[PDB]
């Protein structure tokens, strides 16, 4: 819930479904709950310093 006056309503998260919002005043920001994989390569040294 992002309202131009208030800011992000850090408060309430809206679930799936059809909702009511005030045009121009409020912007919904939709984020995905889905799990996603990410691979990060990292070079690092061990205790032996290799």
From Swiss-Prot:
Tissue expression as described in the entry: Expressed in myoblasts.
Modification note: Phosphorylated. Tyrosine phosphorylation is indirectly stimulated by IGFBP6.
Localization per record: Mitochondrion inner membrane; Cytoplasm; Nucleus; Cell membrane
Expression induction: Expression increases approximately 3-fold upon entry into G1 phase compared to other phases of the cell cycle. Also induced following inhibition of mitochondrial protein synthesis by thiamphenicol.
Domains (record comment): LC3-interaction region (LIR) is required for interaction with MAP1LC3B/LC3-II and for Parkin-mediated mitophagy.
Entry function: Protein with pleiotropic attributes mediated in a cell-compartment- and tissue-specific manner, which include the plasma membrane-associated cell signaling functions, mitochondrial chaperone, and transcriptional co-regulator of transcription factors and sex steroid hormones in the nucleus. In the mitochondria, together with PHB, forms large ring complexes (prohibitin complexes) in the inner mitochondrial membrane (IMM) and functions as a chaperone protein that stabilizes mitochondrial respiratory enzymes and maintains mitochondrial integrity in the IMM, which is required for mitochondrial morphogenesis, neuronal survival, and normal lifespan. The prohibitin complex, with DNAJC19, regulates cardiolipin remodeling and the protein turnover of OMA1 in a cardiolipin-binding manner. Also regulates cytochrome-c oxidase assembly (COX) and mitochondrial respiration.
UniProt record similarity statement: Belongs to the prohibitin family.
Complexes and interactors: The mitochondrial prohibitin complex consists of two subunits (PHB1 and PHB2), assembled into a membrane-associated ring-shaped supercomplex of approximately 1 mDa. Interacts with ESR1, HDAC1 and HDAC5. Interacts with ZNF703. Interacts with STOML2. Interacts with ARFGEF3. Interacts with SPHK2. Interacts with COX4I1; the interaction associates PHB2 with COX. Interacts with MAP1LC3B (membrane-bound form LC3-II); the interaction is direct and upon mitochondrial depolarization and proteasome-dependent outer membrane rupture. Interacts with IGFBP6 (via C-terminal domain). Interacts with CLPB. (Microbial infection) Interacts with SARS coronavirus/SARS-CoV nsp2 protein.
Protein name: Prohibitin-2
UniProt gene name: PHB2
């Amino acid at each position: 819930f992002f309202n131009r006056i208030g800011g992000v309503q850090q408060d309430t998260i809206l679930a799936e479904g059809l909702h009511f919002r005030i045009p121009w005043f409020q912007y919904p920001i939709i984020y995905d709950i889905r799990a996603r994989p990410r691979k990060i390569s990292s070079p690092t040294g061990s205790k032996d310093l290799q």
